């Protein structure tokens, strides 16, 4: 793709309002003056070898399509968001009889094209069949009129989508230029406005393919596609000072943003500006970034104390503490690598800082190392069922870390206990401080101990020699909830350098 | 068929249909007592006949009763912000009438949907039919419904026993725009003979001005209808007839 200058082209009629000797300046989607326009060349013969290349060029809020070919090789265009059956697709077809603009939900083929055949008696290339879409569903609009594409000649078309309307402006002027857009000014009258009502993201040119191409032969004997020369530009929202002559034709225009001189013309609303200094605009330096600074978190929630402490409650007597009315920093909690287990089932731990929850709870308890996995949302386990239960729908963090140094020693930690036997599985987030013997059995023993009656609580054995399976791994379950009340505990307000 | 149709679409995907190349008698609509609310924002209900409009759009959908107020230029709400948003500078008239006996049955009528959750605000006069699951923000979720993510379409609860504010109210939003393009559909005001060189009151497709008409040598291109001057007051008009 070789680029060429726009050279003050793409100027069309903004509104269907007559004006005579009026220097009316309006802002509209326009092709910027002196813009470097890509001369796409779709199919280039090698020997006559076919090289099919119809790229999906982006719409970019307007296309200044143009072609200098007098052979009328181009026949219609393709407009669509994704060019599939799901999305509504726009079709333009320019046959000899008329122009067909048809909009439906179209399942396009890999190569959308118009197939023509040569008839010996008629000696003309009539349309054999159309092969662009496989199916036509949810059809919305159709338009038929005299073909503008047919009848040296340079054909210009601006395609715009504004408020569900398709704007097409056509102008035809014969030129002798080989491959460059003329260094001249030509306004574009509104050919037709179409209430398509769909969004167009990419633009694809459609080319007529002859019977020689339609044959599976790699070489088209009767047709050559090397003349497929077309230009594609992109329109930008620039204010323009259009000049209407006595007939209402825009003989000339200036693009305000192109250079300070054109900004001067737009300011004075005159194409000829006398020598001097003119306050065209004001220079404003935009902010590079945003900085937010806020004081230290005075009411810092004591997560450091509760997480890092010497003495904790046991699992059966697990302590529930209310973390509220303070701002809590979970960034230090997440960044800390001291804890072996940092799992937040309800919410992603990474974004725990930004969210604000009305009420936060922390549970302190002690379980064996092998049974750390038992404390999990909707987990069936002895310790999980009996003393500490976690609900299926859980919004909180379960934090565990090695506690060999904190409390494990040669002396057994007989003070800590777990409920080996209980009548029923405990409800989630329920405290179980029970001294009941729980005799149960075939017959209640009614005593401290029995053959079938056992005291619920059994002493932990914590030893350094116990190893990974039996070392403490003291576990903390953090809890979150929302009670349809204003949040009083939340992450610290962000501070930037 | 715009108003007395058997079926009307839900708010999230409403029917926008063209009205053009006709004669429009808004008076028979206005005088009708079926329409409970006839608030015209950019126009007047009585004076709709005099005007002539380039394009007429009829947006029809079924909403709950209390939500009628929030379908208006510049009002916030559930329906207004996630389902159907009118522009702040809206020129048109909203027509609403009770439909409890029509589209609400003895059992729960649940075919009408409103998008309860959406990422952000709705732009004016745009239809979003996306059914992607909405994530609150705490945790990412897949397409399957989750604890934190919900299906965005929510069904209206319509029962005959519901009172005002909980009953379906058909709303037809007639949005009118004057783009200076040739007008297509407008009032039934009878055309009269054209008068030149004499001071007359002229109503050329709703300009409604007073002046003396003289034949002009200025040439108008076929697409464009009327000219303008510095004051942006009409300096030349092409006859409609």
């Amino acid at each position, epitope marked *: 793709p070789a680029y060429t200058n726009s050279f003050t082209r793409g100027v069309y009629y903004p509104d269907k309002v007559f004006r005579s000797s009026v220097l009316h300046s309006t802002q509209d989607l326009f092709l910027p003056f002196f813009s470097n326009v890509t001369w796409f060349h779709a199919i280039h013969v090698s020997n006559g070898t076919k090289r099919f290349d119809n790229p999906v060029l982006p719409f970019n809020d307007g296309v200044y399509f143009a072609s200098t070919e007098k052979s009328n090789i181009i026949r219609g265009w393709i407009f669509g968001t994704t060019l599939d059956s799901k999305t509504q697709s726009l079709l333009i077809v320019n046959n000899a009889t008329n122009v067909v603009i048809k909009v439906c939900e179209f399942q396009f083929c890999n190569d959308p094209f118009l197939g023509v055949y040569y008839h010996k008696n008629n000696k003309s290339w009539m349309e054999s069949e159309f092969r662009v879409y496989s199916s036509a569903n949810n059809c919305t609009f159709e338009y038929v009129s005299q073909p503008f594409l047919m009848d040296k000649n340079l054909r210009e078309f601006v395609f715009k989508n504004i408020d569900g309307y398709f704007k097409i402006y056509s102008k035809h002027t014969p030129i002798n230029l080989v491959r460059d857009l003329p260094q001249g000014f030509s306004a574009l009258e509104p050919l037709v406005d179409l209430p398509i009502g769909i969004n167009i993201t990419r633009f694809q040119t459609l080319l007529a393919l002859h019977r020689s191409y339609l044959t599976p032969g790699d070489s088209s004997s009767g047709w050559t596609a090397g003349a497929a020369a077309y230009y594609v530009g992109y329109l930008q929202p620039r204010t323009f000072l259009l000049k209407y002559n006595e007939n209402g034709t825009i003989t000339d225009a200036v693009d305000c943003a192109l250079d300070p001189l054109s900004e001067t013309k737009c300011t004075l609303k005159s194409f000829t500006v006398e020598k001097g200094i003119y306050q065209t605009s004001n220079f404003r330096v935009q902010p590079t970034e945003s900085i937010v600074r806020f004081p230290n978190i005075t009411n810092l929630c004591p997560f450091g104390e509760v997480f890092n402490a010497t003495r904790f409650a046991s699992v059966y007597a697990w302590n529930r503490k209310r973390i509220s009315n303070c701002v809590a920093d979970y960034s230090v909690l997440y960044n800390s690598a001291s804890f072996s287990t940092f799992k937040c089932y309800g919410v992603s731990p990474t974004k725990l800082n930004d969210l604000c929850f009305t009420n936060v709870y922390a549970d302190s308890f002690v379980i064996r190392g092998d049974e750390v996995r038992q404390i999990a949302p909707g987990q069936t386990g002895k310790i999980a069922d009996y003393n500490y239960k976690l*609900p299926d729908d859980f919004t909180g963090c379960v934090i565990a870390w090695n506690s060999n140094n904190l409390d494990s020693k040669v002396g057994g930690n007989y003070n800590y206990l777990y409920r080996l036997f209980r009548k029923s599985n405990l409800k989630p*987030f329920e405290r179980d401080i029970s001294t009941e013997i729980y005799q149960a059995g075939s017959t209640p023993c009614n005593g401290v101990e029995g053959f079938n009656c056992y005291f619920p609580l059994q002493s932990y054995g914590f030893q350094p020699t116990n190893g990974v399976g039996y070392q403490p791994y003291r576990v903390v379950v953090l809890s979150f909830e*929302l009670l349809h009340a204003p949040a009083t505990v939340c992450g610290p307000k962000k501070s930037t350098n | 068929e715009v108003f007395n149709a058997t079926r009307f679409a839900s708010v999230y995907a409403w029917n926008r249909k063209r009205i053009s190349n006709c004669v429009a008698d808004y008076s028979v609509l206005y005088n009708s007592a079926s329409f409970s609310t006839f608030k015209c924002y950019g126009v007047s209900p009585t004076k709709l006949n005099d005007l002539c409009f380039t394009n007429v759009y009829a947006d029809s959908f079924v909403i709950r009763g209390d939500e009628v107020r929030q379908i208006a230029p510049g009002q916030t709400g559930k329906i207004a912000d996630y389902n159907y948003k009118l522009p702040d500078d809206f020129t048109g008239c909203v027509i609403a009438w009770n439909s409890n006996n029509l589209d609400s049955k003895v059992g729960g009528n649940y075919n009408y949907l409103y998008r309860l959750f959406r990422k952000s605000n709705l732009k004016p006069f745009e239809r979003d039919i996306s059914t992607e699951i909405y994530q609150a923000g705490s945790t990412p979720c897949n397409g399957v419904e989750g604890f934190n993510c919900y299906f965005p379409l929510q069904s209206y609860g319509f029962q005959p026993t519901n009172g005002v504010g909980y009953q379906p109210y058909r709303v037809v939003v007639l949005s009118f725009e004057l783009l200076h393009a040739p007008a297509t559909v407008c009032g039934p005001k009878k055309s009269t003979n054209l008068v030149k060189n004499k001071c007359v009151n002229f109503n050329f497709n709703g300009l409604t001005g007073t002046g003396v008409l003289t034949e002009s040598n200025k040439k108008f291109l076929p697409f464009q209808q009327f000219g303008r001057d510095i004051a942006d007051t009409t300096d030349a008009v092409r006859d409609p007839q």
Partner: antibody
Amino acid sequence: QVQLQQPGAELVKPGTSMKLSCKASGYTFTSYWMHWVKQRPGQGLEWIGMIHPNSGSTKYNENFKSKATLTVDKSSSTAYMQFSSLTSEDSAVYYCVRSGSYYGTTYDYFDYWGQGTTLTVS
Amino acid sequence: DIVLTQSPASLAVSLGQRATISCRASESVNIYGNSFMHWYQQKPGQPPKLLIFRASNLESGIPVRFSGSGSRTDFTLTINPVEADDVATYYCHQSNEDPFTFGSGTKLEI
């Protein structure tokens, strides 16, 4: 497990006000929330009122607000409800109700209910 | 207040087959993510038995056959292996506000 005891059936004359309570076993009565409900066959269950046994306020539904007096006894783990101007339509089978919460301050779940006593005025 | 309309009321489903019942409240029972809905197993002349005491929480000691689904006003119950004796009247209840209304009733038969 948790067992709540109710009379099998109660036959009374119209216009009589009486106390109905549930004995609580297997759980601490004070901590858990105390609610009440009545059943009428062929008609939906509809709630009565709320009291927290240890230092808790009381609320009732609007239709039956103050129609029946409701109290809680810390001893015997029983909550006593008293009628007022009992009628045939007021008669229904009443169920002892216990409520539980993950964090408190809300009614997350109802864990156990009693068998219920049938207030038949036949 | 909040009214619950159980749909499709009484339902008949074959043994070991998908069964779906949904009750939609007049206004949503979920406050912020968490939902307050209770589904009950009331046999004739027997106390109601819990199935699902939250949006998706399932009571311990009860078969996992009952499943939780739904959001905001609309909550759906799924029973893929419907069993013989568990069929009875089903109630759904909203715990968000003080009216504390329950469902109408949902008869089930094989």
